[model samples]
Target: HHHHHLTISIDIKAEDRKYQIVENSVTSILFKVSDTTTRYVYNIRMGEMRNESETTPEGLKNLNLKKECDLSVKIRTEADQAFVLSEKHRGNIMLVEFFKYEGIPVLCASCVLIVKPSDLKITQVIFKDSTGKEVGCGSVQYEANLKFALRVKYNRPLLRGEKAPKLKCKGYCTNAVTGEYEEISKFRVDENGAYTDTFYCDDGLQESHAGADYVFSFGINNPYGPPFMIEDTNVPVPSIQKIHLIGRNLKKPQITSVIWSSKEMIKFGEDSPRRKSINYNEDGFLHIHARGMYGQKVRVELFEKDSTGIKKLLLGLKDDVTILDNVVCVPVEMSGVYAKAAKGRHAGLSFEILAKVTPLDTSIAAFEQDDKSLIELQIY
Candidate 1:
């Protein structure tokens, strides 16, 4: 067995104040730990990890901080590891030993680095209707003095040995759907003469109800900030319908929105609403439901069709087909024999359908994440 006590200390300096959580940027910190005794690994626990302000109705807020804080960590090896740490943000920095072998040091001790100033940025804020048109800006509303993000920019590129910059900017936007806001992140010019800041308007929140005014605020570190944006485009509202034979979207835009559809809708609730607890006769028809548009189509593979035809059972849908709030129910019958032929330990010959939504307008890029819908079939 080995016994050791690790000692750690940090030199508080003036520059540490810059790590306030403002908008898109986070405050990062590092833990510096050392062992005065034999080479040993150690760990520590984190205590605090954020910043805040406590104020009164008639007073400016006071910044609450715990900069010189303790951490939680563990010792992994008998080898001592020490280094300077960048301290920013708030949180429990726990230090603990991660490995043990016959009391001999197996892993080296290391410090922890934390980023401060939680991320608060208004990534994306847009309001479009069924035709994808933006509502009038003034028609919406916003709360008073909502928390916002700030960004900094530099004017007149700094030369090789510039002392300090005197200019920066901040801005942010809000989503009309969800109230979440994306704020600008803080950053500075690096040794390489490059300025990097978080772009805060990518994240968005859609308001729950219509006609709700949304207000977005951005902080201008120096003077200038991003201008107010207005998007006016037609949004097409697809008709929802009960799908049979897997309602496929032949030509739909790369839109990401939860669509309501019904085709033998199955609900699972507290009373073991799932299939296993209920009678099989009720849910024998289980098939995947998917929709999309254009060349990007939904592919459905029937378990029995492939086996009987010797050829593939393929269905083709033209791009013009649209389901506007319509219910198209897909038959959950894929034949029993095929389900048995494709049976594995956890595998079943189910209605496996793959759907894709293509970008109708090349100008409008495809969604970063493709939409998906799945339904599992079982045979006993």
Candidate 2:
């Protein structure tokens, strides 16, 4: 006699390369080779009640397909707005259906994707080389149609996603004369991956594209990647100049140097998210809001009590966002917070959030909007 264990494995991917959900939704591809149609897929449906007591089986009966093919789900974002600033909605999970075939109705292996809205960022910055895939950085040779791309380093929800809206990533100059972020949304990023959106830094361009410092960002979000400059040469080397090599700038890195969190308690609001330091009764997350600085680069340090009852730092969550604005908002996910910090505990957990901001700096002239907050942070 012999005994054996059977395990089923599955993989998931977006029909599109990037796992971001800003079109409100997208089709997802789930791949698993199976001989029998025993397993299926569905969204784990549950009502608003704290406990998942009303997960109607009737919702499952309708959606299961009659055809026996690969499981695919057309996932869409829910209409319910997140009380916190982060975009992860309550619904929109794609769960794999299941049944056990052990001579009884046994629930076997099931594939799943639990998506949450994520922060969008230019994950990879590629300065192009002539070959199919070689990257450059910093001071690049100047020419028209010089290919550059802002690739989203996806910290997404599903295989998973960020809520980046359908806006083209533009090539902008952090102008030396007027140290302000300048951009034109003319460059477009097609699906499948980041391909084109050439920068026009040719010698005879109307707008002086040739500059010492240039940056890229999606819509009005953060300008990412290291600083780069176009090589300015007077010799008649058009062909060699065509492959304008970029050199990394030799200046000190420009990081927003000043920041401080406030007395504003991470509160839970009833009817609205306005409740103060009083304990949050609802089964939801906390929103850390600030007014002094407008911007992004959210770094949250979470603290909770351990077995000894002494509060200690549990973990840190940092969501990347744009820099240099007067209002700052950071949302914490309760599911993960409870899972990590709770550890089979009850109410009255000692929770604290430490948020950070990437404020404007020396190159960018000081604004009146910044003055009040900058001083207020010091005083109060």
Candidate 3:
């Protein structure tokens, strides 16, 4: 008798590819394939969580089939909500399902709209490529039709495998500018996934489609590559920046910049997200929120190395918002506090303890809507 180790390499090829979920959630992919040569197929489910080392893991579920078959899961998105899925595999192909804000999570091929602009009705939708292969599913409007991108980049929770409501479609809308997407309906996501719908905004004079079909689908030539990681092999490994967070810019208070960890302190609400640091890149801006001293004029300090080798004051955030949320971020006025090259280096960021400060309240409604209704990120 002999002992043997078996390792089979599986390559995937498909047409009309697209991404599911929003830009900030953990994402994964479940696929079914048939090996024509061996007259057998397999079902593979793979994903990852946050962290650089956690890449997509490939698993094989045995299948015994010979004929060519279709294998894909339903996917959709929402307006702004999102969740974390896999930290390991950041960019990989994933199929998702759709749902409504008040519905459950069940993967399906189609969806229906329960909410929309007044007087507008979408009967059916057909997401296709330039060649037209029904790439995605959505509602069709009698008026304007949506033109989504063919290549999608999914980054949220669409394949968490949680059970959801049975009524609503779990999905989201893709950004027309940044090529990024956002999630909607946290209640549904908590149960299963988010709910997404497409429509249009038109006046009596014209038929406008605000939320149209997800028009983006990646062709066969799209590049499927490895995940991004921190590049370093030098000293002081503990001082390296390990995590990168990105934020969604919902058209909001008209503020420009969002900084993190200045000489001052910050406060976040209990109901809101505590960690708010974001990855600043072409897709979107970066905003980080740290804990701030409560009920004081919090002033954060930045340092610089002058010719004398002495630390010099660089920047400061004054008149910042300090709620009881125990969170502090760079003020809207003071964005991009440090140089771009310095962002990820330990020398680029250092927390300074500031005086306890009570944050000034912006209006009740204004404060309530800090992270909502941001400028729609343009998807390329």
Candidate 4:
């Protein structure tokens, strides 16, 4: 027996991640052995073999990782040896050593590299409709059970005349006060390999936020597969959380007023009084006050009104708008930028406002129009 620790590890320094390798892909491996001083002939193999049956080479190559040789060789497959599931290759890699005794090979030490195939992985994880218009990796939505879809890509598919691999995958997320990940959804691969559009969601709090949002993951999770080098996989999706919104948008662009040639700016209500549109050389400000908008992040952009009403050109403005006691407004300084911006619009300015509730930093800007009421100044 070699005196020191007789440990063997796969030289996976280049990958810098883990011992998993994809099947059928050529891999360069060097065995790490403890006894560097001793020169030994090593036979690298996939499955196990008895003493006389094991193939030994004519020339000896040292597997001493720190010394004169790399012992590094490219292994794809050799005849009958390959990544056949349930075969010893999927469990461990055998490295047989020999020392010369009476001009014949004698046992030195045997080591096994604990490695496995990266059988399956998450190729896609997302939240979107059937058309694939999409959502973020983490997005906010009103309190409800959220479903996510993910797809799996496999390193090794079905081998002809061989039994199909029954790999099970799952989706899981934060179970709240519970310390470990609990399975949210799981299924045995139905297509035998392609796991596409597996929809999954947490079991709790669909109607109310009792347990709150969960930390989510999707991929291979099973009681089996661990033994055959088929590992458990989970790709994180940061998560989707439960939230509530106060308003959809700052209420419509009501109580609209603009200072024309006069310096004393008198405003109009109930959609207005004497109306005049801004002209080419006049620098003026449009004042706006709309109900139902209080404390929201909003931006009002000046657009040049088109004759057909479909082609309003978006113009440049420096900043956003303000709110007070459930009322939204656009006033002087920043409003001055609109005058020069809407110069070409001799007809009038078809100004539009954007509002959301969450740092939008949050628009849900109020517009005077009734709900469903041409009607959606759809708030973010």
lDDT of each: 0.28, 0.33, 0.26, 0.34
lDDT of 1 by residue, 234-311 (tens): 431111000011112223333333211233552211111222221223323232222221122222232222223332
**Worst ten-residue run, lDDT, model 4?**
371-380
Off by over 4 Å in 3: 1-167, 173-179, 182-267, 270-380
For candidate 2, the 10 contiguous residues with the lowest summed lDDT are 371-380
Rate residue 115 of model 3 by lDDT.
11
Q: Between 1 and 3, whose lDDT is larger?
A: 1
Off by over 4 Å in 1: 1-7, 10-37, 44-116, 119-122, 125-217, 220-380
Question: What's the C-alpha lDDT at position 254 in model 2?
Answer: 29
lDDT of 3: 0.26
Best TM-score among the predictions, by candidate number: 4
TM-score of 2: 0.25
Report the CA-based lDDT of candidate 2 relative to the real structure.
Answer: 0.33
Give the number of colliding residue pairs in candidate 4. Answer: 21
Candidate 4 TM-score, C-alpha based: 0.25
**lDDT tens per residue, model 2, 270-380:** 122332222223222333332222232344454553445455554566555333222323444444554555554555434432223333333432211122122110000
Better of 1 and 2 by TM-score: 2
Winning model by lDDT: 4
